[PDB]
Every structure is written in structure tokens, then in C-alpha cells.
């Protein structure tokens, strides 16, 4: 009963285009395929914009005011979006491929490079109401004979330098009567001109070529004309100058070569400040900070994005995207991290708060099929198409054990015991489930029982039964633990693809080819509910198709399903363009989400394979925080969260309940009524007002008197608030008071408070312990320095 909205894209920091630094210099805008991702470097946070282009993005640019962001795709279709409010403002079609877009430093005008033409347009005013036809063209310049490589703005918004493939750099005047000032064509270069820049005084013009030559132009007497006074050359053995940027204030030149290495130079002395290599792949884009101390580089082939602090030789950002589609995902039990797996065979650990990759594992030779955490969360387990199951610890980041079959059986699915001592993996070729001992690494036994390939596995978190599902049109419940083993087969109409198991361990849901989500009672081995999903699924006709989408049967099943931790919903995904969120007790579709809107992706709408990328979701899971769910797809890991909470969802609200009345109760010192009334309104701003207005003395009295119905909500509110709040000691004191008064009630109903308790445990563990550890070691470090005798 919560509203999920797309928040950010993990597994993806840079695909192509030009990366731009924010004017303040604290944020970096990187275009990610069909969307734009923004990274908060100072705060170490990230978000991805919700607006979506028809095709992959080609060029972007943010105005100095920080209010307008313009993004243009490969066909020239532009989307103008308010950066601050993150809302799309206008849509415009330039009807031509736009190589580069850049705002004027004044911000009134923005210039567009279209083939052999420079188009200059007027920027719409943000303050004005939504304008119907806001785009007006100031001018269009046609001087070049070949495509424009890039353009640069003068610091006074009066002159433009454009570099083209005509081996020429051409200067314009933005202002008509100043045409006579700057109407010159700079020639002399031997190969495509990549960049032309001004000095801070603008007296000097620096032009660079792809061959690796930098020319310094000065207006001088031979009566006065532009001449090349000095010539500098990059003596790269074979690397070509590909991308270039210049910072007039500090005189830094960052050139990225095709060999994958870049040079930082000081002009006009041509001093090599530093040389450093990103790899063997061409550096696609380079950008400079407003102050000039941070340099951003990136390349498209593997997807690089770094931020380099050349002053201190330190790395503000160094982040990577999966080369392949991410096949599987697993949340840490507390939800602090998520682990993703790809067809490459390399695992990556991701931090939800920062959105940045802490570590990467490449031990697996082939594609990793499944990934799962132990109940403790200290251990991580993965099964790969190389024929091995490997054991990983996220505390020391080491592979402490590896499991493999006698004949190298091909594994696709895995499960780990809640106690973390038994592992079962499954194969499409062997028809039997291999079992291992975590402590020993030996094959305990193999669980036979399917005519068909095992499609999925899962252990009950509490009861420890195994449910195995396969294309044999049946599901079996294995009671391996105990003196005697028992197997309970349950037949199903069609082949099962995905299985999700209730956290209570009393029910199991399974997805079949027919598009049916059937729930069975594990203890009774009887069906309790059925959901139809064939009609809700959205599948687009491929361009290669010769039959209609409606008549098609390609993917109206869900290849992955997962419960909500509350247990009343499932998120389902498959080889399709839809995620369907259903409700168990009533068997109805809550909401549906569109995975992508890129027309390049096949499903959005004789010896050679007609083979192109296809939109599909490999895996889906709910966040243990119960506020978000992530879907593994081709473009990356899409996370939808309920954080915004703009909706008004009152609980037990009455006429006497009003925000003013709640404040009146606070002024009257009636805290308990104010808190209850605030929760009834269910307003985050109001509860926060009441929450922090309670004096410390009155907390235990209030905590003892809170009604039981509101108890799970307040515990949840403290946990999510406390994780990012600065008031560590209040949030704990409330946890102490609430726990002390209602400790027995929570124990009686563990499931009702499961998610809320975990959120509390995240706060007391993932921030609070670390603070006291830094406090206590200093206390002990001190006592040595004073008690110990100093040296002679």
C-alpha cells in the first residue's frame, strides 16, 4: 500500500556523451544511456533523473545559474528540465543530430552544434509560467564545410570558437554589430581540430588538433593580424588527441588520448603537470571544475567515470558500470549494501546510501547466475556458470571457500541456510540438487527427485525447509535437517520459473509459464491462492517480428518474483517491459511499472544472427528496509523507493484532528495526544515537529502510554529518521524508552515489528557502534600516553 517511484540507477555511472561539472563544483552530471545521473561528490550521494528520452542521450549542459539542464538525444530531440525541482519543463525537436550543446556564461543564450551549422538560441525563462512555445532562435551560422567537433564560449558572452573537421578553427560574434571584431578563420592544423579556447584575457587563442598539435594565436603586427607565435606538439607514439578542455583561470589543459591516457599541461609554457592512464580504451569525455581543482574523465567502452584532484593527487570518485547486463541482485540483510552479478562473471558490492562500489570480485570465470546473503549477513554466496559456488566475506573481502561438483555441474540457482552451514545449488543439466557443508566444503549428498532441470531454490528463514521448483511441473519440500528426510511433491499446471518464499516460512509462491503466481501452504502442501498475470504484462513487438504483439507469446510469464517483507505483496519481473506489484490476500494488481522507454531497446514498443539488445529484468527483490525495491535489468539496477511521500494517507483521522490542534497540544504540553494525532494525520513534517519537541524528562512517560496500534509506526519512524539524523542520543533514548515499556509486546509479535526492529538495529549498529569505537580507542590510547613512562 505504498507508492514506489524511480530514484537512482546503480551499476551505471557513465555510458557516453559529455560529463559536466556543476557550477558550484560539488556535483557532477554524467549522462547514463537513456537518462542522466547526478553525483553529489561532497555529500557522496547520487540520484538519477526520472525523465526519460526516446533514445540514448548525446549531449548535455547545465547553466551557471544551476536552474536549467538541457539534454539532447541522438536524433536532436531536446528535453529542458528544472535542475532544482527535477521536473521536465519543455520538449523541443531540433530535427538534426546535435554534436554539442553549451549554455552562454551569461545564461541568456545557448549554442547548438548541428552538423556543419552553429545554431544559437534563446534560453527560456524559468521564473515565468510554463510557456507554450518558449524556444526562439537568435541566429544560425553557416561558415564551416565539415562537421563541428566542438564549440567554446567567450567569458563575456560575445564570441564563439567552433572547431570542425575542416582542419580550421572559426570565431564568430554573438552580437551582430561586433561581427567585424571576430570573423576570422584559423588554419594551419594538419588534422581535425578538437578544441579552440580563449585565454583569461581573451587576447590569446589556443587551438588543438587530433594529430597532437597545439597552436598559440596572437594578434600582432607583421597592420595587425592573427598569427601562430608558438607551436606545441604532443609526442604520443600513436595515441591521437581525442578530447580536450581548458580552464583559463588556472591555465590547465586536460587532453584525453585515444590510447586511454591523459595529460595535464600548463599553458603557454607547455609544462607536463602529470601523465596518467585510464586503460587501453579511448577517453570519451573530459571536464574541469569551476574552481579548476577537480578533473572528471570518462570513457564509453567499459564505462569509466573518475574525478581527479590533481592538487593533492587524490581520487574524489572512481566508479564503474557492468560491461554486461546484471543477472542477479542480493540485498544485505540490513539493506545497507546490495550485491550485483553480471554475465562477465565479476561481482560488485554497492552501498545504498552512497550508491558507490566498495569492492569488485573477479574470481568467477564465467557468468554468475545467482547471489544470496546468509541470515547473519557476514557471509556472501554466489554460483556461476563456470561450474563453481564460491564463498565470500564482506568484512575482510576475501573468498574463504569454493565449492564445485565432481563433474563440474553447471549451476544456475543457489540457497544458503539461515544457520549458514548448508548450501544447495541447482543445475539445468544434471536434474539433482548438490548439497555442501560450509564449514568443510564437502558434498554432503545430492537431492534427487526431479525429472526436470531445477529452476530455483530457497530455504525457509525460520523453519529451514527447502522448496525446489523445476520444469517437471512440480514443487518439492525437502526436510533435510533431522534424523529422517522427507520430500513432499506438489504438482503444478505448467513449468515453474521463479519461486519466492514467505519470511514466515508458512507459504511459498511460484511463477509458471502460463503467467500464474500460485501460493501453496508449506505445512499443508495445499494451494491457498492464485493470481493471473498474463494480461497485465506488457510486451512490445520487436522490429524483427513478423507477428503481432497481441498474438505473440514471447514473455507473458514472470521469470523472477519476490515477496514484500510485510508479506502482503510480490514484485514480479521477466523478459518484458513491465514490473507488476500484486497483493496476496485479494490477488489484485497494485501498480505496474515501465522498465524502459528507449526505442533502441527491442521490446520497448543465413549465418548471421539478427540479434540486438532486448529490455528484460533478470531479478527483483524488496529492500529489507521495506521502503524500496530494486530490479536487475540490462541498463542497470533500477531502484524504486517510497521516500518522497507527497501522498496524504491519514489513519483513523477525525474532525478534531488538525495540524493546528496538534501544535496547540504541544503548547499545552499534552505531548501524548500530539504524537498520536500527528500519526493519525501521518505527516512527516508534523511528526518530526512533535518528535523533537518532547523533553527528555517526558519521554519515558509518553513511551509507556503509546497505543499498541501506533507502536510499529513510531519504531519505523525512528529507525529511518535516526540513520541520517544528527540527534544520535535522542533517537537512542526514545529507542530505550519504547523498548523498555513495550519489550514484551514486540517479543509476542516478532513478525509485526520485524522490519521496524531491523531498521532500529541498522541505526544502533551501522552508525552508533562506530562512534563509540572511535570514542573508546582514544580513551585507551590516552591512558597509555599518560600512564606510560616517556623516553629518555
Amino acid at each position: 500500500k505504498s507508492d514506489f517511484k524511480f530514484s537512482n540507477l546503480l551499476g551505471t555511472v557513465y555510458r557516453q556523451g559529455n560529463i559536466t561539472f556543476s557550477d558550484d563544483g560539488k556535483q557532477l552530471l554524467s549522462p547514463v544511456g537513456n537518462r542522466v545521473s547526478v553525483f553529489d561528490l561532497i555529500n557522496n550521494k547520487s540520484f538519477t533523473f526520472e525523465y526519460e528520452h526516446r533514445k540514448n542521450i548525446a549531449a548535455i549542459d547545465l547553466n551557471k545559474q544551476g536552474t536549467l539542464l538541457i539534454s539532447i538525444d541522438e536524433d536532436g530531440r531536446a528535453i529542458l528540465v528544472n535542475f532544482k525541482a527535477r521536473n521536465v519543463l519543455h520538449h523541443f525537436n531540433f530535427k538534426e543530430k546535435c554534436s554539442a550543446v553549451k549554455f552562454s556564461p551569461d545564461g541568456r543564450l545557448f549554442a547548438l552544434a548541428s552538423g556543419r551549422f552553429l545554431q544559437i538560441w534563446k534560453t527560456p525563462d524559468v521564473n515565468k509560467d510554463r510557456q507554450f512555445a518558449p524556444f526562439v532562435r537568435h541566429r544560425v551560422h553557416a561558415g564551416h564545410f565539415q562537421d563541428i567537433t566542438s564549440l567554446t564560449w567567450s567569458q563575456d558572452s560575445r564570441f564563439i570558437l567552433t572547431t570542425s573537421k575542416d582542419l580550421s578553427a572559426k570565431i564568430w560574434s554573438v552580437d551582430s554589430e561586433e561581427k567585424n571584431l571576430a570573423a576570422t578563420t584559423f588554419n594551419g592544423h594538419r588534422d581535425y581540430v578538437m578544441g579552440a579556447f580563449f585565454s583569461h584575457d581573451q587576447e590569446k587563442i589556443y587551438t588543438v588538433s587530433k594529430d597532437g598539435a597545439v597552436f598559440v594565436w596572437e594578434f600582432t603586427k607583421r597592420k595587425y593580424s592573427w598569427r601562430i607565435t608558438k607551436k606545441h606538439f604532443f609526442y604520443a607514439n600513436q595515441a591521437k588527441v581525442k578530447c580536450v578542455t581548458f580552464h583559463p583561470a588556472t591555465r590547465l589543459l586536460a587532453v584525453g588520448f585515444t590510447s586511454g591516457e591523459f595529460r595535464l599541461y600548463d599553458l603557454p609554457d607547455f609544462t607536463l603537470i602529470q601523465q596518467l592512464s585510464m586503460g587501453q580504451n579511448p577517453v570519451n569525455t573530459v571536464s574541469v571544475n569551476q574552481t579548476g581543482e577537480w578533473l572528471a574523465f570518462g570513457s564509453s567502452k567499459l564505462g569509466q567515470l573518475l574525478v581527479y584532484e590533481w592538487q593533492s593527487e587524490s581520487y574524489i570518485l572512481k566508479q564503474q558500470g557492468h560491461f554486461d547486463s546484471t543477472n542477479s541482485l542480493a540485498y544485505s540483510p540490513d539493506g545497507s549494501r546490495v550485491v550485483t552479478a553480471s554475465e562477465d562473471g565479476k561481482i560488485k558490492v554497492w552501498d545504498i546510501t552512497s550508491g558507490f562500489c566498495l569492492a569488485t570480485f573477479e574470481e568467477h570465470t564465467s557468468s554468475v547466475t545467482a547471489v544470496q546473503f546468509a541470515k547473519r549477513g557476514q557471509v556472501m554466496f554466489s554460483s556461476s556458470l563456470d561450474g563453481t559456488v564460491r564463498a565470500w566475506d564482506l568484512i575482510r573481502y576475501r573468498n574463504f571457500r569454493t565449492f564445485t561438483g565432481t563433474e563440474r555441474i553447471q549451476f544456475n540457482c543457489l540457497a544458503v541456510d539461515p544457520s549458514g552451514e548448508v548450501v544447495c545449488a541447482g543445475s539445468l543439466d544434471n536434474f539433482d540438487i548438490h548439497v555442501w557443508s560450509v564449514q568443510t566444503g564437502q558434498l554432503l549428498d545430492a537431492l534427487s527427485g526431479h525429472e526436470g532441470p531445477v529452476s530455483c531454490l530457497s530455504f525457509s528463514q525460520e523453519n529451514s525447509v527447502l522448496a525446489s521448483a523445476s520444469w517437471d511441473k512440480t514443487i518439492r519440500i525437502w526436510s533435510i535437517f533431522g534424523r529422517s528426510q522427507q520430500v513432499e511433491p506438489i504438482e503444478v499446471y505448467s513449468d515453474v520459473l521463479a519461486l519466492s518464499m514467505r519470511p514466515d516460512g508458512k507459504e511459498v509462491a511460484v511463477s509458471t509459464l502460463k503467467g500464474q503466481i500460485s501460493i501453496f501452504n508449506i505445512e499443508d502442501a495445499k494451494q491457498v491462492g492464485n493470481i493471473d498475470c498474463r494480461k497485465d504484462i506488457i510486451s512490445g513487438r520487436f522490429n524483427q517480428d513478423r507477428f503481432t504483439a497481441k498474438n505473440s507469446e514471447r514473455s507473458k510469464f514472470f521469470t523472477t518474483i519476490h515477496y514484500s517483507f510485510d508479506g502482503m505483496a510480490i514484485v514480479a519481473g521477466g523478459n518484458n517491459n513491465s514490473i507488476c506489484l500484486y497483493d496476496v490476500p485479494n490477488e489484485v494488481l497494485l501498480k505496474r511499472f515501465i522498465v524502459s522507454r528507449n526505442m533502441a531497446l527491442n521490446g520497448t514498443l543465413l549465418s548471421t544472427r539478427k540479434m540486438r539488445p532486448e529490455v528484460r529484468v533478470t531479478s527483483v527483490q524488496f529492500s529489507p528496509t521495506a521502503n524500496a525495491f530494486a530490479a536487475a535489468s540490462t541498463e542497470g539496477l533500477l531502484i524504486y523507493s517510497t521516500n518522497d511521500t507527497i501522498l496524504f494517507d491519514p489513519f483513523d483521522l477525525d474532525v478534531d484532528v488538525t495540524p493546528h490542534s496538534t501544535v496547540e497540544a504541544l503548547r499545552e504540553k499534552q505531548f501524548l495526544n500530539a504524537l498520536v494525532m500527528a500519526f493519525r494525520l501521518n505527516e512527516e513534517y508534523l511528526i518530526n515537529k512533535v518528535y523533537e519537541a518532547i523533553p527528555i524528562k517526558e519521554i519515558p512517560l509518553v513511551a509507556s502510554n503509546i497505543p499498541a496500534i501506533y507502536l510499529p509506526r513510531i519504531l519505523k519512524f525512528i529507525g529511518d529518521f535516526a540513520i541520517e539524523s544528527q540527534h544520535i542520543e535522542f533517537n537512542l533514548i526514545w529507542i530505550k524508552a519504547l523498548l523498555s515499556a513495550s519489550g514484551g509486546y514486540i517479543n509476542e509479535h516478532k513478525y509485526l515489528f520485524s522490519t521496524a526492529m531491523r531498521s532500529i538495529q541498522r541505526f544502533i549498529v551501522r552508525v552508533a557502534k562506530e562512534v563509540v569505537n572511535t570514542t573508546t580507542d582514544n580513551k585507551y590510547t590516552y591512558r597509555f600516553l599518560v600512564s606510560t613512562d616517556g623516553s629518555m
Binding site: 563575456d156 564570441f159 584575457d201 587576447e203 587563442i205 594578434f219 592573427w226
Partner: peptide, 16 residues
């Protein structure tokens, strides 16, 4: 000036 324009030496020989 271009049309696009806006609008001691300490010796190193030291005794040892």
C-alpha cells in the same frame, strides 16, 4: 590588441 579583448629577480648564485 585583439578585437576580442575584454572591454626583483633573485639571483640563484649563492655562497656555500
Amino acid at each position: 590588441v585583439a578585437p576580442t579583448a575584454l572591454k626583483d629577480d633573485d639571483d640563484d648564485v649563492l655562497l656555500d
